């Protein structure tokens, strides 16, 4: 199965929002290899977080990653209009799929 994500998360400018990503003990709960990606419409995906909480360069420190048990979370602090995009998680898995992805969350920013 895919990782479970909410279809839609919204916020006002300046709000802190969190996107959940739920798997199992064979993926999100078994390893520290959770990544998060941002995709604006018609653009290439961008790696925002890897290894649960690590940011590549060029990613705002307003983005942070964590996990607890079988659920990973992406938190966006100080929400800005430019954050309106789709967000996906992935995890390494012990299974043959090797990596498993979430179904994606559309973030809408008020205004
Ligand atoms: Ca908007």
């Amino acid at each position: 199965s895919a990782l479970t994500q909410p279809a839609s998360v919204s916020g006002s400018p300046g709000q802190s929002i969190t996107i959940s990503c739920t798997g199992t003990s064979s993926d999100v709960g078994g390893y520290n290899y959770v990544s998060w990606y941002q995709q604006h419409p018609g653009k290439a995906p961008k790696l925002m977080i890897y290894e649960v909480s690590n940011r590549p360069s060029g990613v705002s420190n307003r983005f942070s990653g964590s996990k607890s048990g079988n659920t990973a979370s992406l938190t966006i602090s100080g929400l800005q209009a430019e954050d309106e995009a789709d967000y996906y998680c992935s995890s390494y898995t012990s299974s043959s799929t090797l990596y498993v992805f979430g179904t994606g969350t559309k973030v809408t920013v008020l205004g």
Side-chain angles (χ1 to χ4, degrees):
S1 298
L3 304 175
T4 307
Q5 291 185 242
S8 180
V9 173
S10 307
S12 301
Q15 192 174 328
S16 178
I17 57 168
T18 296
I19 303 173
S20 61
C21 170
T22 301
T24 71
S25 61
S26 300
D27 42 78
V28 173
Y31 304 88
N32 291 322
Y33 287 93
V34 176
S35 297
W36 290 91
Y37 313 82
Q38 179 186 248
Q39 189 182 30
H40 286 94
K43 304 297 186 191
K46 175 175 179 178
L47 180 68
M48 305 295 278
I49 296 289
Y50 67 101
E51 288 172 25
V52 185
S53 58
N54 212 61
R55 286 179 287 119
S57 325
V59 178
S60 173
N61 59 29
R62 296 182 305 99
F63 292 86
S64 62
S66 62
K67 81 179 169 103
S68 182
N70 295 334
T71 300
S73 292
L74 182 69
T75 300
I76 310 177
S77 76
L79 195 62
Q80 306 187 359
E82 77 208 71
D83 302 332
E84 185 166 300
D86 290 333
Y87 296 82
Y88 292 82
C89 63
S90 68
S91 179
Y92 183 80
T93 175
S94 56
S95 87
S96 269
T97 64
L98 194 69
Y99 286 85
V100 60
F101 280 75
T103 54
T105 299
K106 180 196 182 187
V107 170
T108 301
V109 180
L110 188 74

